[PDB]
């Protein structure tokens, strides 16, 4: 017949190939699809949805709802630190189990800008200002509010519009960063500081709550599929 020649790579099973194969049940009449609402055509559509960040995960708070409640209270001296974490959105313990981190942990490269939304859940009569800052990774962690005002930051004033968005910009020497973070592609630090204080009229409780929210901006991107280091099994589930 036709004179062929089997190239290297024949009779192999590469698990991520793209080939045709004979159907087992020929001329099967499938059921018609209908208009089910809420179709997903890309996993990045999921990663653009906010999910509340467990910033208060100091043990043992991961076994309650207190992992999400970031406490704020009236201070004596200003310029204190509210919270802070490194920006490792698939490896840091604060971010890697939010909705962004579970999508990122299926991949190995990530790129783009990120949003951080802070909804103040105190009383309607309390008033405060906060400084929410991002620091690129050159110099280390900012140890004071004076070191934090030199970075990318935004000064949030609470009021009727009860949430301010810090948009973490993409500053990197590489086009992508590794998800499981290493020393070469560090991404920096997110800190938040008391701009003035929390000032309240009498007969209001002291401690309040700020909820964080992480998502992805419209230029986010992932690459290089893998498995997650989250789910394990020893045997087949009977």
């Amino acid at each position: 017949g036709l004179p062929t020649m089997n190239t290297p790579g024949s009779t192999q099973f590469l698990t991520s190939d793209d080939f045709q194969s004979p159907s087992a049940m020929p001329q099967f009449d499938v059921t018609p699809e209908i208009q089910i609402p809420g179709q997903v055509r890309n996993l990045m559509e999921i990663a653009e949805v906010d999910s509340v960040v467990p910033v208060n995960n100091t043990e043992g708070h991961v076994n309650s709802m207190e992992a999400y409640r970031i406490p704020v209270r009236p201070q004596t001296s200003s310029g204190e630190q509210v919270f802070g974490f490194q920006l490792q959105p698939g490896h840091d313990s604060v971010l890697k189990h939010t909705l962004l981190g579970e999508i990122l942990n299926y991949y190995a490269n990530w790129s783009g800008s990120m949003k951080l939304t802070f909804m103040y859940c105190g009383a309607a009569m309390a008033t405060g200002k906060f400084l929410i800052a991002y620091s690129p990774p050159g110099a280390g962690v900012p140890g004071s509010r004076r070191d934090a005002m030199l970075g990318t930051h935004v000064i949030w004033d609470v009021g009727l519009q009860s949430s301010c968005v810090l948009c973490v910009p993409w500053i990197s020497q590489t086009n992508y960063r590794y998800v499981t973070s290493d020393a070469y592609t560090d991404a920096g630090y997110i800190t938040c500081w008391y701009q003035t204080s929390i000032v309240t009229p009498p007969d209001i409780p002291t401690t309040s709550t700020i909820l964080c929210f992480v998502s992805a901006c419209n230029d986010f991107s992932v690459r290089l599929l893998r498995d997650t280091p989250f789910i394990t099994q020893q045997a087949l589930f009977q």
Partner: protein
């Protein structure tokens, strides 16, 4: 511009306006669309990245193992009989289940590939000349007559699709179309089976894909071998709806969603960062 490519960043300047892009209300259930060119001064950057690796086709389109079926050439126990079976489900491995549990209703064709390996069982001697083994994998639809044992009437596969494979060649592979009676595979089902709200609870009531029976075509060997047939599934032509939140606690069973409670995340010492 092409489709799939992410958006650029327009050049911004200093502003002092009534407009407040940074302030919003989360209470309305609405994600803010604050691009970085709203809260700082940016340069025009022509972004060339695409989102090809993140679509539902490429996210699912890699073949994953779903079952490990074992069957010998000589009965030793009911478990290591001449034949074995498997109820077709994707809920027995932990890798593919967590991917398919990200969406509520999915609709896809399938591509089933078998990696079959035999190993000679431990005895007091092993010197035997054997011809190459031939395996049979018969797919039984819901309602079909099942084989009772070896040499059954029902291995004649008068209408059931079957495959025959001699060891040493390429692995077998056949494609399965969309098989459900509804309009999408229900990955979840918050409901009961009977109308009195009792019986079995959960997703097992709908997904009846059928069985899958394995055996050796060869009648016997001189010394018994133990074959193992790993089954690989690859979803192709995938549509998905209603994205669920990804599972956190590891699984316990194949018919349930039961779990032990776990932390929301890992712990750390304090809420602040304390270096210079």
């Amino acid at each position: 511009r092409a489709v799939g490519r992410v958006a650029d960043t327009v050049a911004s300047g200093p502003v002092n306006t009534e407009q407040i892009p940074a302030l919003t209300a989360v209470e309305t259930g609405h994600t803010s669309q604050v691009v970085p060119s709203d809260t700082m001064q940016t340069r025009h950057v022509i972004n060339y990245h695409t989102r090809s690796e993140s679509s539902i086709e490429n996210f699912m389109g890699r073949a994953a193992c779903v079952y490990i079926a074992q069957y010998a050439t000589e009965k030793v126990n009911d478990e290591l009989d001449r034949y074995t079976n498997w109820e077709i489900t994707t809920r027995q491995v932990a890798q593919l289940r967590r991917k398919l549990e990200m969406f509520t209703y999915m609709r896809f064709d399938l591509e089933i590939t078998f990696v079959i390996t035999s190993s000679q069982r431990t005895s007091t001697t092993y010197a035997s000349d054997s011809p190459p083994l031939t395996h049979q994998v018969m797919y039984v639809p819901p309602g079909g007559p099942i084989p009772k044992s070896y040499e059954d009437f029902a291995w004649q596969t008068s209408t059931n699709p079957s495959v025959f494979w001699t060891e040493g060649n390429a692995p077998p592979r056949m494609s399965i179309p969309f098989m459900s009676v509804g309009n999408a595979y229900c990955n979840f089902y918050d409901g009961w089976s009977h109308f009195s709200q009792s019986g079995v609870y959960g997703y097992t009531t709908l997904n009846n894909m059928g069985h899958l029976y394995f055996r050796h075509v060869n009648k016997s060997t001189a010394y018994p071998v133990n074959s193992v047939a790993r089954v690989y599934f690859k979803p192709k032509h995938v549509k998905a709806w209603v994205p669920r939140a990804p599972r956190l606690c590891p699984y316990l069973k194949a018919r349930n969603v039961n779990f032990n409670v776990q932390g929301v995340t890992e712990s750390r010492n304090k809420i602040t960062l304390d270096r210079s």
